Structure formats: structure tokens, C-alpha cells
Symmetry: C2
Subunit: 540 residues, 2 copies
């Protein structure tokens, strides 16, 4: 009632999930496999067809945006490779939508195809023809393709401005145009920058409204979505039990109590496909443990108590439990226990040796937390570049996030990849810059800062002597440059194996979804995003 600050939007809904029995689950599995083989047969048909470039382009695009391209991964990559090798594929004669589709697909699969294919859509000024604004479909396609841009894609930089202006006008002057639901959604969330699972859920609904949609592809996307959603909800029921058990170790509740759905929503970002259950188990659990130690560093304890907790984290041993103040013991024990559990989970595969790399990242998290605490306790005001480089990029959590993602991926995560991520590569820093800058820009305005608690916008304002609007614009430029670094990371040849780079790309995407500021955690948008992918199956 009054003074009640205990929101429980979800209650026991996820704990009360009842999975269907094994006979049923295997029946649904075989149904979806039957339609998968149907899709693959039709795909083979389109590949050997003599002309017909656009049909194969659209078929590939639809299976990808329906969220079932993972069930056809190899088949698609080969096909796109063939398209890239066909130097007489006919791109010169495509309209805006299909030129944009060819460009976007090729860029997303690592092929560094040129922006010159867009030249025929420019006028004498060197700008895109405003006459193209009547081709709503093609403007939408160009808008979506422009978000794969890297450094040196000035055409795509201007294409984003051009398409944004015309798409906003479509929303405003043509409210009843058949594409307005899609245009409005894309303006809020470009597909390439959204969470794969959630954007595929929305595209399934859009695709059903397309009069020319392929019925078997729509059925494939719906059936696989419901199959994969049952796996998610079984995982979330179990992980809810584990999280609740951890919460009941303390007498007073942690802030993260009842926040398993939000944490698991986060966890679905890097990976939603069935084969990453172990990945999702690790990411969720580290998420909870991180939240718990974050509570320690955000409380009203002394800087000596925070020093002791950081040192004890560096030693990483239960002997430290007797030396720590009472209120820190549950969090410290959870650190030791959870990573021991990771070791047990990886022993049958002979992979326990890797837990070490995640443990070090966790120790790093404590160190940067300590630094942030220190800056506040000793009333030091860093510059923006100092705030980022010394604590805040890493304290966002993606140096730990990337290593924990690799933790569950099996033989592809070699020791060499763990050491690569441990050395703070440029792309992991980019993911962290995106997250940290969006979190800080959206958290509060300048006049709502906390004295002596550094933040990116306040640090930029005090360092460069500019106003809030300017600081927001320059930091937004840093976010955009980091996004271009991420898109260059997906261009061949790959630094690390693609399954590993894709985790970092997805970490950036889930941040674009959660920190859509213009709230951050546990608000109405988060509740609706969870409702979209984790409550009911898709009808029929």
C-alpha cells in the first residue's frame, strides 16, 4: 500500500510453468523437423533455378528474419557465398528495396560489398532522390540496411538521415498506410540493432499480414518459435528456483529480488537458440552474482569495508568469510559457490580449466567497482576519458559478459579465445562503450547528478566546458563509432570464429533494446518485451 516499494509484476508465473510431457514434446519436435526439410527442399529448388535472383534473396531474408536461419545456417552461408561470387548476379538492375537487401545480406555475412550500388539512387546533388519517398517499401529497406554501416560508409550515414526524414513523414501524413506498423517499429528499433529473438517475434506478426507471404515459411517460423519458447520457459522455471534460493540466504532482500525475468531477458540477448542452454545458465547466474556484489559497493559501508571486500575477492577463498563484516558474507559466499558450480558443470566435458578466465573477470569487476567507490569517497572528479578508461567501461559488465558467454560454448571457445578476450580487445571495449554511454546518457539529466559520483555526461561537461545537449551529441558520436567498430568486426576475415564474434554483436544489440532512452530496468517497456517472447505461444 502506501510506502510499498516492492513491485512484483510477475509473481510466481514462471515458477508455475508446467512443461508438456515427453511424447508431446517429441511430436512437436518432429513436426518442426518435417517443415524444416520442406523449407530446405524449396531452398535447393531456388538455388539451381537459372534466373530468379530476387526470389532467392527474399527467401533467404525471410527465413533469417523469421528467426529460423539457425536451423539452416550452413545452407544459407554457402548460398550467400555463391551470390558474392556470382559477378553477373544482376544487382545493377534491382530497385531500392532489393539493392538494399542484397547489400545488407552480403554485409551481414562478412562480405565487404561496396556502397557504389546505391549510386543510381542519387541525384545531381549527390543526395538520394526525394522522388523515391513514394516507394515506402524501398525506403524502409534502405533504412534497415544503413545500420550495418562501418567507417567509410558515408553513403549509409546520409542514407539514414534521408530515410529517417521520409519515414517519419510516412508515419505523420499516411497514418493508414499498410506499412505504418512496420515503419513505426523500425523507427523505434532497426532490425539489425535489435534482439534477434524479439525482432523475429515481431517479424512473424508482420509477415502474416503480407498478402504474398509463403505459408510454409510462416508455419516454420511459428512452430519453431513455440518449440524454442518451451525450452526458454523450462530454463527460466529452473533458474528462478536457483535465484530464489540465493535470495533466501539473506534476511533483508537484495534489490535484485524478483528480477529473474529481467535478468533472463538480458540473458536471451547473446543467444536464444536451443544449443546455448549452458551459456544462458552461466550468464544468468553471473548476472545475479554481479548484482549481489554491486549491492555491496552501492551500500553505505565504509571505504575500509570495501577495501577488505575487494582484497578478499582477489584472494577468492572461503577463509575470507570469517574476516568480512556480516552483511558481506552472503555475497562473498555466492561468488565462491557459483563459480565452483561452473567448474562442476564443465567437468564432464573436460573444460573446468576455463572457469579461471571468468573468475578473473569477476575480480576485475570488483576492482573497477572499488575504483568507482574510491573516486566517490575521496571526492575525486575524473575527466570523461579517465572515468571511462579506468573503471566505467569495464564496470558496465561486458568484459565479464563476453568471457562468460564463451564459458558455455564448448570446443569452439579455445583457450586462445579466452586469452584474446582477457586482453581487452577493441571490440569488447566497443560493446562496453555502447553499454556504458547509453546507461549514463539515459540515467539522469545534469541537474539530477549525485555530488562526487562520476558519470559520463557530467564528466564530459566539466572536462570540455560544453552544455548537456553538446555532451550528449558528442557521446552519441562515440556510441555510433563503436557501432561501426562492431559492424567491421563482422567483416571477413574474422578475428575470432564467427560464433564468438556473434555473442559480442548480440551483447551490443540487447543493450540497444534495454537502454532505449528518449527508463532502463523493470519498467513498462521491459514488461512488454518480456510478454512478447515469454508468455503465450503464437496461435496456430
Amino acid at each position: 500500500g502506501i510506502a510499498s516499494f516492492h513491485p512484483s509484476p510477475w509473481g510466481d508465473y514462471f515458477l508455475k510453468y508446467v512443461p508438456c510431457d515427453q511424447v508431446t514434446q517429441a511430436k512437436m519436435e518432429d513436426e518442426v523437423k518435417k517443415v524444416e526439410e520442406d523449407v530446405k527442399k524449396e531452398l535447393r529448388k531456388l538455388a539451381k533455378a537459372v534466373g530468379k535472383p530476387l526470389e532467392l534473396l527474399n527467401f533467404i531474408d525471410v527465413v533469417e528474419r523469421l528467426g529460423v536461419g539457425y536451423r539452416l545456417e550452413q545452407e544459407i552461408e554457402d548460398l550467400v557465398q555463391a551470390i558474392f561470387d556470382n559477378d553477373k548476379f544482376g544487382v545493377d538492375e534491382f530497385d531500392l528495396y532489393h539493392t538494399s537487401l542484397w547489400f545488407r545480406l552480403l554485409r551481414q555475412h562478412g562480405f565487404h560489398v561496396s556502397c557504389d550500388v546505391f549510386g543510381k539512387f542519387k541525384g545531381r546533388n549527390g543526395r538520394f532522390k526525394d522522388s523515391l519517398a513514394s516507394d515506402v517499401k524501398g525506403i524502409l529497406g534502405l533504412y534497415e540496411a544503413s545500420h550495418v554501416r562501418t567507417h567509410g560508409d558515408d553513403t549509409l550515414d546520409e542514407a539514414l538521415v534521408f530515410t529517417t526524414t521520409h519515414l517519419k513523414a510516412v508515419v505523420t501524413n499516411q497514418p493508414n498506410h499498410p506499412l505504418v506498423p512496420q515503419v513505426t517499429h523500425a523507427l523505434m528499433q532497426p532490425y539489425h540493432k535489435g534482439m534477434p529473438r524479439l525482432e523475429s517475434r515481431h517479424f512473424i506478426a508482420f509477415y502474416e499480414k503480407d498478402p504474398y507471404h509463403d505459408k510454409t515459411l510462416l508455419k516454420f517460423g511459428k512452430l519453431d518459435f513455440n518449440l524454442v519458447q518451451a525450452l526458454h520457459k523450462k530454463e527460466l522455471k529452473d533458474l528462478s528456483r536457483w535465484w530464489k534460493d540465493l535470495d533466501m540466504h539473506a534476511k533483508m532482500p537484495f534489490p535484485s529480488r524478483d528480477r529473474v525475468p529481467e535478468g533472463y531477458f538480458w540473458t536471451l540477448g547473446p543467444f536464444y537458440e536451443p544449443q546455448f542452454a549452458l551459456c544462458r545458465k552461466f550468464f544468468l547466474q553471473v548476472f545475479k552474482v554481479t548484482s549481489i556484489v554491486d549491492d555491496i559497493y552501492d551500500a553505505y559501508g565504509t571505504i575500509d569495508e570495501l577495501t577488505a571486500f575487494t582484497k578478499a575477492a582477489e584472494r577468492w577463498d572461503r577463509s575470507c568469510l570469517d574476516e568480512l563484516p556480516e552483511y558481506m558474507k552472503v555475497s562473498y559466499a555466492s561468488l565462491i559457490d557459483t563459480f565452483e558450480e561452473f567448474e562442476r558443470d564443465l567437468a564432464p566435458q573436460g573444460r573446468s580449466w576455463s572457469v579461471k578466465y571468468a573468475r578473473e573477470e569477476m575480480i576485475q569487476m570488483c576492482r573497477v567497482y572499488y575504483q568507482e567507490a574510491k573516486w566517490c569517497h575521496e571526492k575525486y572528479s575524473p575527466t570523461c576519458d579517465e572515468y571511462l578508461e579506468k573503471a566505467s567501461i569495464v564496470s558496465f559488465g561486458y568484459n565479464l559478459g563476453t568471457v562468460v558467454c564463451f564459458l558455455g560454448m564448448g570446443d569452439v571457445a579455445t583457450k586462445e579465445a579466452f586469452e584474446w578476450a582477457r586482453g581487452n580487445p577493441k571490440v569488447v571495449r566497443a560493446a562496453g562503450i555502447i553499454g556504458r554511454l547509453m546507461d549514463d546518457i539515459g540515467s539522469h539529466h545534469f541537474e539530477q547528478g549525485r555530488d562526487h559520483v562520476p558519470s559520463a555526461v557530467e564528466c564530459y561537461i566539466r572536462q570540455h566546458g560544453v552544455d548537456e545537449v553538446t555532451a550528449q551529441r558528442e557521446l552519441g558520436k562515440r556510441v555510433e563509432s563503436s557501432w561501426k567498430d562492431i559492424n567491421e568486426m563482422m567483416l571477413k576475415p574474422y578475428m575470432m570464429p564467427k560464433p564468438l564474434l556473434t555473442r559480442i554483436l548480440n551483447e551490443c544489440r540487447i543493450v540497444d533494446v534495454i537502454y532505449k532512452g528518449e527508463y532502463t530496468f523493470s519498467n513498462t517497456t521491459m514488461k512488454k518485451n518480456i510478454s512478447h517472447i515469454l508468455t503465450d505461444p503464437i496461435p496456430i
Copy 2:
């Protein structure tokens, strides 16, 4: 960053408030007092004028909705009384807007005028003429008047359905109509049911856009608003200091740690005018201690520890500090300390004897909290009427709230009034029913309930064997009937003096504003509502 559940939308903004110097504040005070005398002279002019009902009606309505009728309280009441006695006022000839204005104004001032005044607006069917929908202004006025309805006002019940239908059509078919902002706002928040401070702010903005507005009235409202806002910001600076000092007693943060702005918003509901500073101090402080003890009963402690805390609260003595478990001691001490501070604040006027009644309500709160905890641990499923009568109406906080409101009101709040409120009168029960039922209806849906945690919708569903929609509708009817009891409370002859009933009416209004689900504490709507009345002055 990731796993960060520490939102601080406001930071140190209210702590860093800098008041103006005493000479400046006295200057602004004298300016507003001068324009008050101007307004009063003009009002005297309108009263001593033959056959000008509509000009005087509108003048009174505007000074009230500008939020400065408290500077003319007696002068306005007398005038309205004179209007009720006229009997030749000419109401028989008013159009829809002015008939609605006359009816609403008289009802709000205790005069039980009849619904028959609306007979000329009905057709042969006995329903309001749909032809009236073209009089947007009059439809809006009738909509606003209909929320003062009591038992036996079937005309107003039909008026709400009629005007809602047509106002919704104006919003959808006439988006650019000049009244669309006002209609959209009224459809979300009826004036009569809103928080006076916040609704007067919105009306100040609306009134400036009326080409026929009185420039001096607008200046009166703007200047008084900025003057009273300086008082609120000084009070909130001080109370933020007190609240932060209390919070630093605990090592781990309470859920209510950074929630002074939301709590003070709550506190402005019952009273916003300068004379209730002490009231606001008490309500806010009680709010905070209530939140602290609510945390104890919501934590994962044993039913034996909650038994002990409840018994210790019944004893109300610092000696219990030695008997309680550690994590309860700061909460218990805050109880003892805060109510002692109330004794000190009321000693100079010789009223410390009244703190007793508030202490009793606080003890009742622990009891009803205990009952709710007991039901959960004994896995008991109460009946809906049982859920309400035995814990949940009182646990919303308004038996305590009404007694704490009276605590700061001085000689008007007699010992007899405290004893009237201690005995659970029907109108305090109505306020609690409104609060509890809106909170429970909006908190979660049926499938998101917590096992063994009673809540109104779930209890009604399991008691009566109905579905969620029906339980929500029947409970909404209970809320509506309680609102009719509240409107009856403001009809003469008054049970208690009017200043005391008005606190109860305002408690219901602040609940209608905060639990506007269509959804709880500390969300973007609460942040915007605080922004509207507590950040910047009104320009010019």
C-alpha cells in the same frame, strides 16, 4: 550497468536547492498579496452586480481551478452560499456548460442541489440528447461535474457514460480541435479526482491558451504557484536531509532509500498550501518509517521474529531494542525516535498529547502487517471480505494517514476528532477501500499472483467462482461506491469540520493519481508528475 537495480532519477537535485534571500522572498510575497487584493476587489465587483450570474460563476470557478481559492476561502464560500440562497439565480436558462458549472460548484461546497437541473438536456428516451455532442465545451463540463456524484445520482452515472463516449469521439475524429489537450487530459484525470496542486498547474497552462482569459487571474495563479513552489522546495530540501540521515543508519539499503521525491509527492496530496508545513513534515516522516517497517514484514524472516517485532511495537519502548534481532533494531528505533520528535514539535503549542493517537495507528499497522504475513506462512487463503476486513483495508495506510494528517492541523483537530478517526468511521474506510482496491487491481494479473499471498482480485475470483474480468468489474463497483461515500462526506451538514474532511477527500484524490493503471510507484509517470510541480517555476 548490467544488473544495476539502483535507479536514481533525481540524485541530489532537491538537496542542492538554494533558497532566495529573505528580502527577496518578502518582495515576492508582497507582489502576490497585491494582486490578491486586485482579485478580491474584482470579485466584490462581480458580487454587487445585478443579473450577471455567469460572470461570477466563471470567476469563482477559475480562481479555484488556478489553485488560489485558498487565498479567498471565506470570500468564496460566502458567495457560493449566497448563490444557493438566491433561488432566482437564473439556472433554468443556462446552457450545458454553465448548468454543469453551477451544479458542480454547489456540490463541491456541500449544497445538495438536485440532478433535475439536467432534465432539459434529455430527450424523450430519458437519455442525454446526442445532438449536444457538438457542444464540446458543454460535454466536457458535464463530464467534470459527473464525478461529484453520490448515491441517488443516476443522472450523473448516465452522464459519465454519455460524455465519455462523445469526448473519446472528439479525440479520435477531431484531433486538431482546440479543446483536444483539455479533453485528453480530462479523460485521463477528472479535475475533481485529481491532486489539487498538480491539476491547478495543468489548468494554469490551459487557461493561458484561452483567448478570453483574465490576465490578472492568470498572473495571480502563476505568481502564487511560484511562491508556494519555493516553500515546497525548501521543505523537501530539509526532509531529504532527514530521510538521508535515517537511511545511513543501515548498512544495506532499504527499497525506499532514494524515494524522498515520490514520498513528498504523496505528501503534497492531502495539503499543498503554506499553512500545512508541519502536516507535510509529519506525513512524510511517517511515510518513511512506515516504509521501513513494511520492509521488515516483507523480508525473509521467520514468523517467530515477526511475532516478536509486532509484540515489541505493542510495547513501544526502547527496552525492546535489546530483545529484537539485529536487522530489526534500526527500524524499531526509527519508530520510537520519530514519534518522540513529533512530541517535541507539538510541545510549544501544547499538543504533545495527540501523538498518542498516531502511535496507536502505527501499532495497528504492525498488527495488520503481521496478519498478512501470518496468512502467507500458514498457507491460508482468505475470503475477499475477510482479506479486506481483517488486514488489507487498514494496511493500505489511511487510518494511519488520516490520523497523521490531523496531527499537524492545530486547534481544529480536537481530541474528539482524533477519537472519531480512531474508531474507523465509514469515510476513512472508504478512502482505504479506494486505496487498497486500486493498488491490488493494478499490481498484477491473476496468472502473475504470488502463491499464498492474498490479493483482492485473486481472493474475489476464488471466493465467488468468477473470472478475472468479472472480479475486476465488481471490485471497480466497490471503488465507485466508496467514491460516492466520499462525495457524500462533503455534503452539509458536515460530520467533522470541513478542513478535516478535506484531508480525507485529498487522500482519495492522490490515490486516484498515483494508481492510475490502464502503474505504480517510481515510474515515468510519477517522475513527470514530480517534474510538473517541483522543478522549474512557471515562466513570466
